[PDB]
Amino acid sequence: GPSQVIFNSVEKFYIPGGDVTCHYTFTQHFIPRRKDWIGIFRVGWKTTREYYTFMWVTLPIDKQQEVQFKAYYLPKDDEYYQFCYVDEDGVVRGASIPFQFRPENEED
Amino acid sequence: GPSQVIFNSVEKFYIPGGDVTCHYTFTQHFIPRRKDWIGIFRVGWKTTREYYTFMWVTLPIDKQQEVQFKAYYLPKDDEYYQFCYVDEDGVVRGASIPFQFRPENEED
């Protein structure tokens, strides 16, 4: 079904070694739950158990939301990744555009 | 460490269906932050993610502080609860005496 969690301001590349802020908003009828989470997943991931790293959904919740991924936990390779919001039932409720962890280049 | 947020005038029981005013004061060197909050937690809570309900810390801040919990959001059972002040880093900076939501009784 349609995404119930929308990622905003997602970059196409993030600087290696920097912390990354992930911005998201809940759609009108969506009810977030305390064990929901956001993963960073390699594009083409098969199951939610494959996340590279994750953060639990930011609490408390009443509006812009954000969660911070610390540099230590971010990918070091050149593969493509996305954010995915996974609810307590294991259902993906939102997914972002793909990005890499790399410096800016001329093709950008 | 020692509490940096002190709850005052906390009752041992609050009337079911009434709004509850939570009174607190900041200790001298404490610096409140805009995403700090006060939760109502069941006694014996393990993580700050377990709050029953919450309010963001009252703003603006310059002294007595207070925040109002609306009746709709309060517990309906007979369990024991407390207020806890949680800062932006997830650290508990103050905690109140325990209370229930119930009428006065003879044991009181």
Residue numbers in the entry:
A (entry chain A), B (entry chain A): 19 to 80, 87 to 132
From the article:
Autophagy receptors target cargo to autophagy by binding ATG8 on autophagosomal membranes. In this study we discovered that the ubiquitin-binding autophagy receptor NDP52 binds preferentially to LC3C, in contrast to other autophagy adaptors including p62 and NBR1 that nonselectively interact with several human ATG8 orthologs. NDP52 comprises an N-terminal SKICH domain of unknown structure (aa 1–127), a central coiled-coil forming region (aa 140–420) and a C-terminal ubiquitin-binding Zn finger domain (ZnF, aa 421–446). We determined the crystal structure of the NDP52 N terminus (aa 21–141) containing the SKICH domain and CLIR in isolation and in complex with LC3C.
Since the SKICH domain fold was unknown, experimental phasing was performed exploiting the anomalous scattering of cadmium ions contained in one of two independent crystal forms. Single anomalous dispersion (SAD) phasing of a 2.7 Å data set was used to build an initial model, which served in molecular replacement to determine the 1.35 Å crystal structure of the NDP52 SKICH domain in a different space group. The structure revealed a β sandwich fold comprising seven antiparallel β strands, organized in two sheets of four and three strands. Some loops connecting the seven β strands of NDP52 fold back to form hydrophobic interactions with the β sheets. The SKICH domain resembles an Ig-fold lacking the eighth β strand, which places the N and C termini onto opposite sides of the β sandwich. The specificity of NDP52 for LC3C is mediated by a noncanonical LIR comprising the tripeptide Leu-Val-Val, which we refer to as the CLIR motif. This binding site in NDP52, located between the SKICH domain and a coiled-coil forming region, is distinct from a previously predicted LIR within the SKICH domain, i.e., Trp-Ile-Gly-Ile55-58 (Kraft et al., 2010). While this sequence is reminiscent of a LIR motif, our structure reveals it to be buried in a β sandwich-fold and inaccessible for canonical ATG8 interactions.
